[PDB]
Write an enzyme that holds these catalytic residues in place. Sequence first.
Site, PDB file in Angstrom:
ATOM      1  N   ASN A  78    -104.110  31.556 -28.951  1.00 29.16           N
ATOM      2  CA  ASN A  78    -104.181  32.271 -30.226  1.00 29.16           C
ATOM      3  C   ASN A  78    -105.379  33.189 -30.363  1.00 29.16           C
ATOM      4  O   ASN A  78    -105.640  33.742 -31.442  1.00 29.16           O
ATOM      5  CB  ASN A  78    -104.184  31.287 -31.388  1.00 29.16           C
ATOM      6  CG  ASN A  78    -103.028  30.339 -31.325  1.00 29.16           C
ATOM      7  OD1 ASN A  78    -103.131  29.261 -30.746  1.00 29.16           O
ATOM      8  ND2 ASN A  78    -101.896  30.751 -31.869  1.00 29.16           N
ATOM      9  N   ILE A  86    -107.552  37.096 -33.391  1.00 31.78           N
ATOM     10  CA  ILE A  86    -107.105  35.728 -33.672  1.00 31.78           C
ATOM     11  C   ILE A  86    -105.719  35.723 -34.325  1.00 31.78           C
ATOM     12  O   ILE A  86    -105.431  36.538 -35.202  1.00 31.78           O
ATOM     13  CB  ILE A  86    -108.095  35.018 -34.637  1.00 31.78           C
ATOM     14  CG1 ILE A  86    -109.501  34.985 -34.033  1.00 31.78           C
ATOM     15  CG2 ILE A  86    -107.628  33.619 -34.929  1.00 31.78           C
ATOM     16  CD1 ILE A  86    -110.562  34.512 -35.010  1.00 31.78           C
ATOM     17  N   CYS A  87    -104.874  34.784 -33.921  1.00 27.55           N
ATOM     18  CA  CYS A  87    -103.583  34.623 -34.564  1.00 27.55           C
ATOM     19  C   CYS A  87    -103.610  33.286 -35.315  1.00 27.55           C
ATOM     20  O   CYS A  87    -103.459  32.228 -34.709  1.00 27.55           O
ATOM     21  CB  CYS A  87    -102.484  34.636 -33.493  1.00 27.55           C
ATOM     22  SG  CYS A  87    -100.945  35.358 -34.037  1.00 27.55           S
ATOM     23  N   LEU A  88    -103.803  33.347 -36.635  1.00 30.09           N
ATOM     24  CA  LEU A  88    -104.025  32.164 -37.466  1.00 30.09           C
ATOM     25  C   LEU A  88    -103.599  32.533 -38.893  1.00 30.09           C
ATOM     26  O   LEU A  88    -104.040  33.547 -39.447  1.00 30.09           O
ATOM     27  CB  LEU A  88    -105.513  31.777 -37.431  1.00 30.09           C
ATOM     28  CG  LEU A  88    -106.017  30.638 -38.318  1.00 30.09           C
ATOM     29  CD1 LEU A  88    -105.410  29.334 -37.866  1.00 30.09           C
ATOM     30  CD2 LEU A  88    -107.536  30.563 -38.256  1.00 30.09           C
TER      31      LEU A  88
END
Length: 149
Positions: A78, A86-88
């Site tokens: 992520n 960031i993948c969140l």
Amino acid sequence: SRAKRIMKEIQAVKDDPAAHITLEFVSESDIHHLKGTFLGPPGTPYEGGKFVVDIEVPMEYPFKPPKMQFDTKVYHPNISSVTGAICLDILKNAWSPVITLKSALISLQALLQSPEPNDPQDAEVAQHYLRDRESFNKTAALWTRLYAS
């Protein structure tokens, strides 16, 4: 007030060192650029690492999410090892005014402990994580030694 919020948050983090989160302004010229850091979760390939995250808080903070991207080069589904992106969800669509920068930083530490390959930043790394965990972990741990020392 963004500024009032931020100074409160700075104090909340400074008074609780044992949480192993840090929050600092980048320069003396403004209060909307900060660096956050957290330590790698123990029992994890990232144990022993110190991870640095660039933070930019928008004018509308806390009603808009801060822009966060890793400065540390990290091997993780992520996180982009190139852009630090960031993948969140909380950083995109699940942000809430009650969430703090410290909280976000703790969520990023929780992301290292519990990768989310089902919504990857780096598709190949997510694929690696799923296809060959053992090998993934060795890489993550080496990169922690190389880039998060």
